[PDB]
């Protein structure tokens, strides 16, 4: 179809057609609210690749997330400790801003369930994304066997455990020699299993 034609266009962000159209929506979203609903995906090729099926029950929310890094919340610096922990200004956050975007939408719209998000526009002071939520209690979602996995109670608040594509990136889990410090389930699980004493019965 035409999606592959749209696919290679969106990889041309520096081109004049994209450099224009990106700055329109970036201007357009910047006059809107911080958290609101979009009727249809503005980036449809990236939607269906992430699992968006255009039907009743698929609702998307386009939010704006503040640019930059994170600074330590302490009055006048207030780190009554060693020079290692006086660092307050050039600190960075652990989770990606795309994962923070799925939090603010998922937490506020706790009636729905998060699936995936994607980049739609950038500014020096903001960072815009369109998260794809799902409705757990519409029969068009409930009756299709491919998507009834959402309704299971372990898929409540995937944005709070980081089970999304943005969520799975920041935990740093994967296969290979590079992720030895998270062999097991989690970075907490690897450390826990590495620091217990196995007091055998016969030692």
């Amino acid at each position: 179809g035409a999606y592959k034609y749209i696919q290679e266009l969106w990889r041309k962000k520096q081109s004049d057609v994209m450099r224009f159209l990106l700055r329109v929506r970036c201007w357009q979203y910047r006059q809107l609210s911080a958290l609101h609903r979009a009727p249809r995906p503005t980036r449809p090729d990236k939607a269906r690749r992430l699992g968006y099926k255009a039907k009743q029950g698929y609702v998307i929310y386009r939010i704006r997330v503040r640019r930059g890094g994170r600074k330590r919340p302490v009055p006048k610096g207030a780190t009554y400790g060693k020079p290692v922990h006086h660092g307050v200004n050039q600190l960075k956050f652990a989770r990606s801003l795309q994962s923070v975007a799925e939090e603010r939408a998922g937490r506020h719209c706790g009636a729905l369930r998060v699936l995936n998000s994607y980049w739609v526009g950038e500014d020096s002071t903001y960072k815009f994304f369109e998260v794809i939520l799902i409705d757990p209690f519409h029969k068009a979602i409930r009756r299709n066997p491919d998507t009834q996995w959402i309704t299971k109670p372990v898929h409540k608040h995937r944005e709070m455990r980081g089970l999304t594509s943005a969520g799975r990136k920041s935990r740093g889990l994967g296969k290979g020699h590079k992720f030895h410090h998270t062999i097991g389930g989690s970075r907490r699980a690897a450390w826990r299993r590495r620091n217990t004493l196995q007091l055998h019965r016969y030692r």
């Binding site: 826990r192 620091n195 217990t196 004493l197 196995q198 007091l199 055998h200 019965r201």
Partner: protein, 210 residues
């Protein structure tokens, strides 16, 4: 402060290990529950073997074990494609498959298809419906000889060849094994510089004439 003589200990007990001591009082109780579930899994698929699907012959890497044979994860497709059995059929009759495997040699590939032909010989297949024997089923008199197979089916044995006594030849008496090693240790190591010094001879020849 250490005494007169001893060792240097670096005991990694400086964290709060007391809070994370996992004791092993489950071990006699865990073996009770495990075998009970291992018997429940047994009686659940009772005519099928308790060992589960077959595991292929597999060589293991890391040259310390490269002369050993393990139990594989599953038969590769090129082990099953020439076997005459499609991969989405062999799962139904107890043949573990995983497609990621390779067979860069042939002797392992032929030995495993040898293991499936004899497994296909041993296989007593029930009819789909009790009133009709299908084309690939076992005959009725073999159903009475169908019970549960304990232990790993067709166990892998790391057997070896016997070598009969032979008379030593004269070349083998003149054979310098260790002197061949250090000569070969030179040949493999100095292969690069001999490949390099072979290249500049030509340019110092062509400018002599031209």
């Amino acid at each position: 402060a250490p005494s007169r003589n001893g060792m240097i200990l670096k005991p990694h007990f400086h964290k709060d290990w007391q809070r994370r001591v996992a004791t092993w009082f489950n071990q006699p109780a865990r073996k009770i529950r495990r075998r009970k579930a291992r018997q429940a899994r047994a009686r659940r698929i009772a005519p099928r073997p308790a060992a589960g699907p077959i595991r292929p012959i597999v060589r293991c890497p890391t040259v310390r074990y490269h002369t050993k044979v393990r139990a594989g994860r599953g038969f590769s497709l090129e082990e099953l494609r020439v076997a005459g059995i499609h991969k989405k059929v062999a799962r139904t009759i107890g043949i573990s498959v995983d497609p990621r495997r390779r067979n860069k040699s042939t002797e392992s590939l032929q030995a495993n298809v040898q293991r499936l032909k004899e497994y296909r010989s041993k296989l007593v297949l029930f009819p789909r419906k009790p009133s009709a024997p299908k084309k690939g089923d076992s005959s009725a008199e073999e159903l009475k000889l169908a019970t549960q197979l304990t232990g790993p089916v067709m166990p892998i044995r790391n057997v070896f060849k016997k070598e009969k006594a032979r008379v030593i030849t004269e070349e083998e008496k003149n054979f310098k094994a260790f002197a061949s090693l250090r000569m070969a240790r030179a040949n493999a190591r100095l292969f690069g510089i001999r490949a390099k010094r072979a290249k500049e001879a030509a340019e110092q020849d062509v400018e002599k004439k031209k």
